[PDB]
Amino acid sequence: MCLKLNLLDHVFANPFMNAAGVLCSTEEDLRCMTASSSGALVSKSCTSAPRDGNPEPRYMAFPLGSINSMGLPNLGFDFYLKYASDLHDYSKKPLFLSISGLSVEENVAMVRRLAPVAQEKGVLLELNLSCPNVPGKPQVAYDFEAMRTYLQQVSLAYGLPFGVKMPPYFDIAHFDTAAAVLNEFPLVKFVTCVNSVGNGLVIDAESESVVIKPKQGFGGLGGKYILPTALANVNAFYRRCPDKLVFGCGGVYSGEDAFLHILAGASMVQVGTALQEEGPGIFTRLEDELLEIMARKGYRTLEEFRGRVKTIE
Amino acid sequence: MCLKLNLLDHVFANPFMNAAGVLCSTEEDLRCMTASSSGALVSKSCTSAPRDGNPEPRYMAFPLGSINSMGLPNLGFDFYLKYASDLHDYSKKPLFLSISGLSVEENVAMVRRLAPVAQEKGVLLELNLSCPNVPGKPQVAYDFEAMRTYLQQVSLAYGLPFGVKMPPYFDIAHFDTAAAVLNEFPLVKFVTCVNSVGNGLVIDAESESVVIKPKQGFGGLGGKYILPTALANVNAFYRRCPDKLVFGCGGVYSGEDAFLHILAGASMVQVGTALQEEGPGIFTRLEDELLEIMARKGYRTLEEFRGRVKTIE
Ligand SMILES: Cc1cc2nc3c(=O)[nH]c(=O)nc-3n(C[C@H](O)[C@H](O)[C@H](O)COP(=O)(O)O)c2cc1C
Ligand SMILES: Cc1cc2nc3c(=O)[nH]c(=O)nc-3n(C[C@H](O)[C@H](O)[C@H](O)COP(=O)(O)O)c2cc1C
Ligand SMILES: O=C(O)c1[nH]c(=O)[nH]c(=O)c1CCc1ccc(C(F)(F)F)cc1
Ligand SMILES: O=C(O)c1[nH]c(=O)[nH]c(=O)c1CCc1ccc(C(F)(F)F)cc1
Predict the structure, then answer these.
(1) Of the residues A96, A213, B25, B150, which has the maximum number of CB atoms within 10 A of its CB?
(2) Phi then psi for A108, rounded to 5 degrees?
(3) Contact B217/A168, CB-based, under 8 Å?
(4) End-to-end distance of chain A based on CA atoms, in angstroms?
(5) C-beta A195 within 6 A of ligand 1
(6) How many Cβ atoms sit within 10 Å of the Cβ of residue B15?
(7) What CA–CA distance (Å, rounded) separates A259 from A290?
(8) SS3 call for B158
(9) Cβ-contact A275, A38 below 8 angstroms
(10) CB distance B150 to B107 below 8 Å
(11) Would you put residue B199 in left (φ > 0), alpha (ψ -120 to 50) or beta?
C-alpha cells in the first residue's frame, strides 16, 4: 500500500507538502524540502523585490500553535523563478511557487514571467490572496470585489491553471460569496484552505508582555488553535467548488489530523507550524501515521474517503 | 488584595460571570448562577417568543474546547423580563439580560419593555449582535450597515446605557470599522469581546462523522481554541474605544487566562465552555488562582494591571 496520487497533470508520492512560508525561503530551505519525504513543496510567497520583513521577534510557537507577523521576508521573485527554472529537480517532486505582490500590477507582472516557466518546467502557481489592498480596505480575499479583479487580471495575464491560497472565513454567507467568486474563474483549479487565522494576540503571563514585536503583538495564528476552522473551510469550499481541487492547510500535526482534512475534502495536505517545530522528519511520520489509520479502517486509496465526512441525519 | 470592581453604577465582588448561553436558560440555571461565587450573571440571549432551538446533538465539548449550533433555544423574553423584575435577588449580585432578536423590530420591541425594569431594578442590557439577520446575509456584526441600524434603533428605543456582545474579527480594517461604528453610540457603554469563532467544523476520526447535527456539523467554537483570538479582540476594542468598558470572553479556564484578559483590557471576564464543562464551582477556583497570581506579582487591585499589556520596543 502506498499514498501516491495524480493531480493537476502531475504525480505526487503522497499528499503532504510544506505550507507556504515554512522551510521554503532560501535555496538551502528548498533543497531541504526537496530532500524530504514530502510529496511536493511550495516556495515562500514572493514580491517583485526582496524584502527583509518585520523586526524580530516575529514568530513564536507554543504547545497549542504559533503566532507570526513575518512581514513577507523573501528573496524576491527573480530568485524563486530562477529556482523553478534552473535549480529545482522535478524528478524528485512537484514544485509550487507562491506569489503575493503588493498590488494587482505587481502580481500581473510576476505571473507574465512565470507563464513560460510553467509551460516549460511544470511549476504550479499558488496565488496568495492575503495581500495588501487599497486604503481602508481589508486584505484582498476579504474584499470580494478586489478578489474578483485580481483573479480576472491574473487569469488574463497568466493563462494557465493556477490555485489560490485563502484566509479563513467564519460566516456561511461569506463562504457562499467567496466560492461564487472563485467559480467565475475556470483557470482556478485548486483552492488552499487556510492561511493563518488573522490578528490573534498571544500574551505571556510572567512578563505581562506580548510575544512578537510587529503590530503591537498581533499576528496570524496557526497550529492546534485552528484545526476546526481549517476543516470547516476545506469542507465549505469542497462542497461549493465541485470542479476544483481543495488543498487543506491548518492544524496538521499527525496522520489523524491529515485524515480529517482528507475526509473534509482535501487533495493535498500542507503542514506549517508543526513542520516549523518538528522539522522535515515530520513527513515520514505523517505518512506512516496516515497509512496506519487507513489500514485499520480497510481503506486502500485516498479517493475511498476523500470528502466523505458523514453528517448526522 | 481584592477583586472588587465598581462599574456601570454597580458593585461586583469579582470580575467573573457566565458567558451568555451557558447555565442561564431556566430559572433553575439563574438561581444556580446566583448562588455561585461569580461576580455577576447574564441570562440566555432571548427572542420575543420561546424557541426550542435546533435538533440535538447541538453542543459538544473536547479537550481543546467546544462547538455549538444551539439555534437560540430560550424561554422567551417575557420569562427573562419577569426574572429580572420579580425573581432575581439584586442583593446577591448584578444581572445582565441578553437579547438576540431576529430582526431590528424584534429587538426594539423587547428593549422598549426592558427599559422601565432597567431603570427601576438596575438590570443591564447586553445586545447580541453576533447573530442572524436576513438569511444569506452575514451575521449582523459582520454587516456594518446593519449593525449601525440596529444600534441607532435600539439606542432610540431604550434610552439607557447598554452593552453589546461582538463576534471576533480577524482583519485590522475590521477592527477599525467596527469600533468606529460603536463609537457613534454614546449609550454603548460596554463591549463584550468575543462570541464564538464562527462556523468551525469538528470531525471525529473513528466515526468519520461531524459531531453536531445542525448545519452539516458547522458551529461556533469556544474554549482553548479561541483564547488568542479573544485576547486580540479585547485589546483591539480596548485601544479603539477609550470611553467604553470591554468585557472579555473566550478561552478562560484558569486564573491565568483571566489575568491575560484583564492585561488586555478586560473589566468583567466571562466563562463559557469551561463553565459548561466544570460547573459553577469553577468560580471559586478562578478567584483563588487569580488572587495567587496577583499576590506573586504584588498587585493589590485589578486596576493596577488592567490594560497594561506590554508591547516590544
Ligand atoms: C512563519 C510563517 C510564515 C508564513 N508565510 C506564509 C507565506 O509566505 N505565504 C502563505 O501563503 N502563508 C504563509 N503562512 C501561513 C501558512 O502557510 C499556513 O497557512 C498557516 O500557518 C496555517 O497552517 P498551520 O496550522 O499548519 O501552521 C506562514 C506561516 C508561518 C507560521
Ligand atoms: C452552548 C452555548 C450557548 C451559547 N449561547 C449564546 C447566547 O445565547 N448568546 C451569546 O451572546 N453567546 C452565546 N454563546 C457564546 C458564549 O457566550 C461565548 O461568547 C463563547 O462560548 C466563547 O467563550 P468560551 O471560550 O468561554 O466558550 C454560547 C456558547 C455556548 C457554548
Ligand atoms: O509573511 C507573513 O507575515 C505571512 N504570514 C502568514 O501567516 N501568512 C501570509 O500569507 C503571510 C504573507 C502576507 C503578506 C503578503 C504580501 C505582503 C506585501 F505585499 F506587502 F509584501 C505582506 C504580507
Ligand atoms: O444559540 C446559539 O446558537 C448561539 N451560540 C453561540 O455560540 N453564540 C450565540 O450568540 C448564539 C445565539 C445567536 C445565534 C443564533 C442561531 C445560530 C445558528 F442557527 F447558526 F445555530 C447561531 C447563533
Answers:
(1) A96
(2) -60, -45
(3) no
(4) 34
(5) yes
(6) 27
(7) 6
(8) helix
(9) no
(10) yes
(11) left
Whose grid coordinates read 497594561? B308
Contact B91, B62 (CB under 8 A): no
- Taking each continuous run of H as one helix and of E as one strand, the counts in chain A are 9, 16
C-alpha cell at B71: 439555534
Which atom in ligand 2 lies closest to the alpha carbon of residue B226? 25
**Domain limits, chain B:** 1-53+72-196+223-313, 54-71+197-222
User: Between the CA of residue B199 and those of A142, A234, B255, B275, what are the distances in Å?
Assistant: 16, 12, 28, 21
Contact A225, A79 (CB under 8 A): no
Record the cell numbers describing residue B292, joined without a space: 495567587
Q: Is the CB of B44 under 6 A from ligand 2?
A: yes
**Which cell goes with A307?**
470528502
- Grid cell digits, residue A134: 487599497
Count of CB atoms within 10 A of residue B244's CB?
Answer: 21
Contacts of A114-117 spanning 24+ positions with Cβ under 8 A: A114/A81, A114/A84, A114/A158, A115/A157, A115/A158, A115/A159, A115/A160, A117/A81, A117/A84, A117/A85
A1-53+72-196+223-313 architecture in CATH?
Answer: Alpha-Beta Barrel (3.20)
DSSP label of B252: -
Resolution, given in Å to one decimal, reads 1.6
Rounded to whole angstroms, how far apart are CA atoms A253 and A268? 15
Ligand 2 centre to CA of B66 (Å) is: 10
Please answer yes or no on whether A312 and B217 come within 8 Å at the CB atom: yes
Backbone angles phi, psi at A127, to 5 degrees: -90, 115
Please, what is the end-to-end C-alpha distance for chain B in angstroms? 31
The answer for B225, left when phi > 0, alpha when psi is -120 to 50, beta otherwise, is alpha
* B231/A198 CB distance under 8 A: no
Burial string for B88-124 (b: 16+ CB within 10 Å, else e) reads beeeebbbbbbbbbbebebbbbbbeebbebbeeeebb
CATH superfamily of the domain spanning A54-71+197-222: Dihydroorotate Dehydrogenase A, chain A, domain 2 (2.30.26.10)
Rounding to the nearest 10 degrees, give the CA dihedral for residues B210, B214, B218, B223. Answer: -90
Chain B from 175 to 194: CB within 8 A of any A CB: 175
Contacts of A228 (CB under 8 A, 6+ apart): A251, B67, B200, B201, B202, B221, B225
